[PDB]
Amino acid sequence: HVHHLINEYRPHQARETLRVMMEVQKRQRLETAERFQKHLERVIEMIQNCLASLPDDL
């Protein structure tokens, strides 16, 4: 009975820890995707600025 109670009590805490870890992993993935999108947008803006500047000098 004590082993069954220990298994029942540890399951809820383990599930809560797993959910917290999954939420943290999802937040980290969302932050990485946002950083990658911002980097791509900045690279596109810089490419456009360089292309506009090159057409003036030539």
Binding site: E41, I44, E45, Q48, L51, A52, L54, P55
Partner: protein, 44 residues
């Protein structure tokens, strides 16, 4: 005769001028296309 041949144009100047006009038109078209491409930049 040597000074006349020194110019460089071996073939008659008719086809030379035709090709020069064609190259000028091509250069103008390329410049206009490059300007139109580098002007319309509104993406994000």
């Amino acid at each position: 005769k040597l000074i006349s041949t020194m110019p460089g144009i071996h073939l008659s100047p008719e086809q030379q001028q035709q090709q020069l006009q064609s190259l000028r038109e091509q250069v103008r078209t390329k410049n206009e296309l490059l300007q139109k491409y580098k002007s319309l930049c509104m993406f994000e």
